[PDB]
Amino acid sequence: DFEHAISDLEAHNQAKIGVALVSENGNLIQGYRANERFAMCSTFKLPLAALVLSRIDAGEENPERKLHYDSAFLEEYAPAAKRYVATGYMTVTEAIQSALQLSDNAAANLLLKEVGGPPLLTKYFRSLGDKVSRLDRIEPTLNTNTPGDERDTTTPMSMAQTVSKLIFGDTLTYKSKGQLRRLLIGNQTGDKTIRAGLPDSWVTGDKTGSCANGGRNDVAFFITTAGKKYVLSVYTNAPELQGEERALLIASVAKLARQYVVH
Ligand SMILES: [Cl-]
Ligand SMILES: [Cl-]
């Protein structure tokens, strides 16, 4: 069964794996360590983007507003922000796009400053009925993934439920929900993670992330050919795998979870 299959992957890879497959309405279909805490790493950028879109929905932000920065704001991984820095800004829209599809860390920090910092993302999670997910630091130190530390964590089930609300539920405006979904489908960083374990015929959007101590995660929504809608969260710590094997591990978990998608 699912429990034994995932436990076998853990032992074989000397990894810790947390996974939740949920339906459109947030109900757990299959899970393993689904309520244990893992570091978000870059997966937090999905609900962050949703918070910024929600602020645009509410008239508190403009998609074309210029978020100003200089070279000192750059991060080691910030491919878009490095290109825009001579102009002195990225727009809210550019920062959302870049944070989601490239995982740009300076763009993410621009958004975190825009929303009022990590505590305001925690507040947003709480507002959605997510009692667990929390952001505490900005890039890059939110990635430390230290044992016993609850900063910057989620659980597979809480994140999957939160994502299902944003992607399939009524929380965002029709416009913002579409923008978020299409951005995630166009993610550039997830071709070898959850997507690689699902049929190519299915619509998939996702947000990846990696952390210290071998953390590598992905959260995806997908829609089957039959039109059945799901969210799959996969959180892993696999310190003895190399990066490509960590992606393959995620794909392997997705393949196992895929057998519980009914036609
Ligand atoms: Cl870069
Ligand atoms: Cl990695």
Coordinates of C-alpha atoms and ligand atoms in Angstrom, one line a residue:
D1 CA 0.0 0.0 0.0
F2 CA 1.0 3.7 -0.1
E3 CA 2.4 3.7 3.4
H4 CA 4.7 0.8 2.6
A5 CA 5.7 2.1 -0.8
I6 CA 6.7 5.5 0.7
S7 CA 8.4 3.9 3.7
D8 CA 10.5 1.8 1.2
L9 CA 11.5 4.9 -0.7
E10 CA 12.6 6.5 2.6
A11 CA 14.7 3.5 3.7
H12 CA 16.2 3.0 0.2
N13 CA 17.2 6.7 -0.1
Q14 CA 17.8 7.4 3.6
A15 CA 15.4 10.2 3.2
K16 CA 12.4 11.7 4.9
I17 CA 9.4 12.1 2.7
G18 CA 6.1 14.0 3.4
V19 CA 3.4 13.7 0.8
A20 CA -0.3 14.6 0.6
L21 CA -2.6 14.1 -2.4
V22 CA -5.8 16.0 -2.0
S23 CA -9.0 16.5 -4.0
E24 CA -10.2 19.8 -5.3
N25 CA -12.1 20.3 -2.1
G26 CA -9.1 19.6 0.2
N27 CA -10.0 16.1 1.3
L28 CA -7.0 13.8 1.8
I29 CA -6.9 11.0 -0.7
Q30 CA -3.5 9.5 0.2
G31 CA -0.8 10.8 2.5
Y32 CA 2.4 9.9 4.3
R33 CA 3.9 12.1 7.1
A34 CA 1.1 14.4 5.8
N35 CA 0.9 16.3 9.1
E36 CA 4.6 16.5 9.9
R37 CA 6.4 19.8 9.5
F38 CA 8.9 20.4 6.7
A39 CA 10.6 23.6 5.5
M40 CA 8.8 25.4 2.8
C41 CA 11.9 26.5 1.0
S42 CA 10.8 28.2 -2.2
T43 CA 7.3 26.7 -2.2
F44 CA 6.3 29.7 0.0
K45 CA 6.5 31.8 -3.2
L46 CA 3.1 30.3 -4.4
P47 CA 1.0 31.6 -1.5
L48 CA 3.1 34.8 -1.4
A49 CA 2.1 35.5 -5.0
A50 CA -1.6 34.7 -4.0
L51 CA -1.3 37.3 -1.2
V52 CA 0.0 40.0 -3.6
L53 CA -2.8 39.1 -6.1
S54 CA -5.4 39.3 -3.2
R55 CA -4.1 42.8 -2.4
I56 CA -4.5 43.8 -6.0
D57 CA -8.1 42.2 -5.8
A58 CA -8.7 44.5 -2.8
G59 CA -7.4 47.7 -4.3
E60 CA -4.4 47.9 -2.0
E61 CA -1.9 47.3 -4.8
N62 CA -1.4 48.1 -8.5
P63 CA 0.1 45.4 -10.8
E64 CA 2.3 48.0 -12.5
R65 CA 3.7 49.6 -9.4
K66 CA 7.4 49.9 -9.4
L67 CA 9.2 48.1 -6.7
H68 CA 12.5 49.9 -6.4
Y69 CA 15.9 48.3 -5.5
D70 CA 19.6 48.5 -6.0
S71 CA 22.5 46.1 -6.3
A72 CA 22.7 45.6 -2.6
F73 CA 19.2 44.0 -2.7
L74 CA 20.4 41.3 -5.1
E75 CA 20.7 37.7 -4.0
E76 CA 23.0 34.9 -5.2
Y77 CA 20.1 33.4 -7.2
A78 CA 18.2 36.3 -8.8
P79 CA 18.4 35.9 -12.5
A80 CA 15.7 38.3 -13.4
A81 CA 16.5 40.9 -10.7
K82 CA 20.1 40.9 -12.0
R83 CA 18.8 41.8 -15.5
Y84 CA 16.4 44.6 -14.3
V85 CA 18.8 46.2 -11.6
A86 CA 20.1 48.9 -13.9
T87 CA 16.6 50.2 -14.4
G88 CA 16.2 50.4 -10.6
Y89 CA 13.0 48.5 -10.3
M90 CA 10.7 45.5 -11.1
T91 CA 7.0 45.9 -11.3
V92 CA 4.7 44.0 -9.0
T93 CA 3.7 41.8 -11.9
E94 CA 7.4 41.2 -13.0
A95 CA 8.3 40.3 -9.4
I96 CA 5.3 37.8 -9.2
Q97 CA 6.2 36.2 -12.5
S98 CA 9.9 36.0 -11.7
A99 CA 9.4 34.7 -8.2
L100 CA 7.1 32.0 -9.4
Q101 CA 8.5 30.8 -12.7
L102 CA 12.2 31.4 -12.1
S103 CA 12.1 31.2 -8.2
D104 CA 14.1 34.5 -8.2
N105 CA 15.0 35.3 -4.6
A106 CA 15.4 39.1 -4.9
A107 CA 12.0 39.2 -6.6
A108 CA 10.6 37.2 -3.7
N109 CA 12.1 39.6 -1.3
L110 CA 10.6 42.5 -3.2
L111 CA 7.2 40.9 -2.7
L112 CA 7.8 40.2 0.9
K113 CA 8.6 43.9 1.5
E114 CA 5.5 44.8 -0.5
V115 CA 3.1 42.7 1.7
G116 CA 4.7 44.0 4.9
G117 CA 7.1 41.1 5.6
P118 CA 7.0 37.4 6.7
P119 CA 4.5 38.0 9.4
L120 CA 1.9 39.2 6.9
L121 CA 2.2 36.0 4.9
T122 CA 1.6 34.0 8.1
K123 CA -1.4 36.2 8.7
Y124 CA -2.6 35.4 5.1
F125 CA -2.2 31.6 5.7
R126 CA -4.3 32.0 8.9
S127 CA -6.9 33.9 6.9
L128 CA -7.3 31.0 4.5
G129 CA -7.8 28.5 7.3
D130 CA -4.3 27.2 7.2
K131 CA -3.5 26.9 10.9
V132 CA 0.1 25.6 10.5
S133 CA 2.1 27.2 7.6
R134 CA 4.3 30.1 8.7
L135 CA 6.9 32.4 7.2
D136 CA 9.5 34.0 9.5
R137 CA 12.6 35.0 7.5
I138 CA 13.3 36.5 4.1
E139 CA 15.6 35.0 1.4
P140 CA 18.0 33.4 1.8
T141 CA 18.0 32.4 5.5
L142 CA 14.5 30.9 5.4
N143 CA 16.2 27.9 3.7
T144 CA 18.3 26.7 6.7
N145 CA 16.0 23.7 7.3
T146 CA 17.5 23.0 10.7
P147 CA 16.0 20.0 12.7
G148 CA 13.7 21.0 15.4
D149 CA 13.0 24.5 14.0
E150 CA 9.4 25.6 13.2
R151 CA 10.4 28.8 11.3
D152 CA 9.4 28.8 7.6
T153 CA 7.6 25.5 7.8
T154 CA 4.4 23.9 6.5
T155 CA 3.0 20.4 6.4
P156 CA 2.3 18.5 3.2
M157 CA -1.4 18.4 4.0
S158 CA -1.6 22.1 5.0
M159 CA 0.2 23.3 1.9
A160 CA -1.9 21.0 -0.4
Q161 CA -5.1 22.3 1.2
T162 CA -4.0 25.9 0.9
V163 CA -3.0 25.4 -2.7
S164 CA -6.3 23.7 -3.5
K165 CA -8.2 26.7 -2.0
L166 CA -6.2 29.2 -4.2
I167 CA -6.2 27.2 -7.4
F168 CA -9.6 25.5 -7.3
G169 CA -11.5 27.4 -4.7
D170 CA -13.3 30.7 -4.5
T171 CA -10.7 32.8 -2.6
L172 CA -9.2 34.8 -5.4
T173 CA -11.0 36.8 -8.0
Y174 CA -11.6 35.1 -11.4
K175 CA -8.8 37.3 -12.9
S176 CA -6.3 36.6 -10.2
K177 CA -7.0 32.8 -10.0
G178 CA -6.4 32.6 -13.8
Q179 CA -3.2 34.6 -13.6
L180 CA -1.9 32.4 -10.8
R181 CA -2.8 29.2 -12.5
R182 CA -1.3 30.2 -15.8
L183 CA 1.9 31.4 -14.2
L184 CA 2.3 28.1 -12.4
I185 CA 1.7 26.0 -15.5
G186 CA 4.5 28.0 -17.1
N187 CA 6.9 27.3 -14.3
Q188 CA 10.4 26.8 -15.7
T189 CA 11.9 24.9 -12.8
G190 CA 9.6 21.8 -12.3
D191 CA 10.0 19.8 -15.5
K192 CA 11.9 17.0 -13.7
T193 CA 9.9 16.9 -10.4
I194 CA 6.2 16.2 -9.9
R195 CA 5.5 16.7 -13.6
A196 CA 8.0 14.1 -14.6
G197 CA 6.0 11.5 -12.7
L198 CA 2.6 12.4 -14.2
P199 CA 1.1 11.7 -17.6
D200 CA 2.0 14.4 -20.2
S201 CA -1.7 14.7 -21.2
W202 CA -2.6 16.3 -17.8
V203 CA -2.6 20.0 -17.0
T204 CA 0.1 20.6 -14.3
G205 CA 1.3 23.7 -12.6
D206 CA 3.7 23.7 -9.7
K207 CA 6.2 25.5 -7.4
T208 CA 9.5 23.8 -6.5
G209 CA 12.0 24.5 -3.8
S210 CA 15.3 23.4 -2.3
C211 CA 16.9 24.0 1.1
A212 CA 19.9 23.2 3.1
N213 CA 20.3 19.7 4.6
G214 CA 19.1 18.1 1.4
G215 CA 15.6 19.7 1.3
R216 CA 13.8 19.4 -2.0
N217 CA 10.1 20.0 -2.4
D218 CA 7.4 20.5 -5.0
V219 CA 3.7 21.3 -4.8
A220 CA 1.6 20.9 -7.9
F221 CA -2.0 21.1 -9.0
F222 CA -3.2 18.9 -11.8
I223 CA -6.2 18.2 -13.9
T224 CA -6.6 14.8 -15.5
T225 CA -7.9 14.3 -19.0
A226 CA -11.3 13.3 -17.4
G227 CA -11.3 16.7 -15.7
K228 CA -10.6 15.5 -12.1
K229 CA -8.7 18.1 -10.1
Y230 CA -6.0 17.5 -7.4
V231 CA -3.2 19.0 -5.5
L232 CA -0.1 17.0 -4.7
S233 CA 2.5 18.2 -2.1
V234 CA 5.8 16.4 -1.9
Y235 CA 8.4 17.5 0.7
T236 CA 11.7 15.7 1.1
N237 CA 14.9 15.7 3.0
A238 CA 17.5 13.6 1.3
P239 CA 20.9 14.7 2.3
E240 CA 22.8 11.8 0.8
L241 CA 21.2 12.1 -2.7
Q242 CA 22.6 14.3 -5.4
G243 CA 20.3 17.0 -6.8
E244 CA 19.2 15.0 -9.8
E245 CA 18.4 12.0 -7.7
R246 CA 16.4 14.3 -5.4
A247 CA 14.2 15.4 -8.3
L248 CA 13.8 11.8 -9.4
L249 CA 12.7 10.9 -5.8
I250 CA 10.0 13.5 -6.1
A251 CA 8.9 12.1 -9.5
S252 CA 8.9 8.6 -8.0
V253 CA 6.5 9.8 -5.2
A254 CA 4.3 11.4 -7.8
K255 CA 4.1 8.1 -9.7
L256 CA 3.0 6.3 -6.6
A257 CA 0.4 9.0 -5.8
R258 CA -0.9 8.9 -9.4
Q259 CA -2.2 5.4 -8.9
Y260 CA -4.8 6.8 -6.4
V261 CA -6.2 9.2 -9.1
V262 CA -9.5 7.5 -10.2
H263 CA -10.8 7.7 -13.8
Ligands
CL1 CL 21.2 34.2 -10.7
CL2 CL 18.6 19.7 -4.7

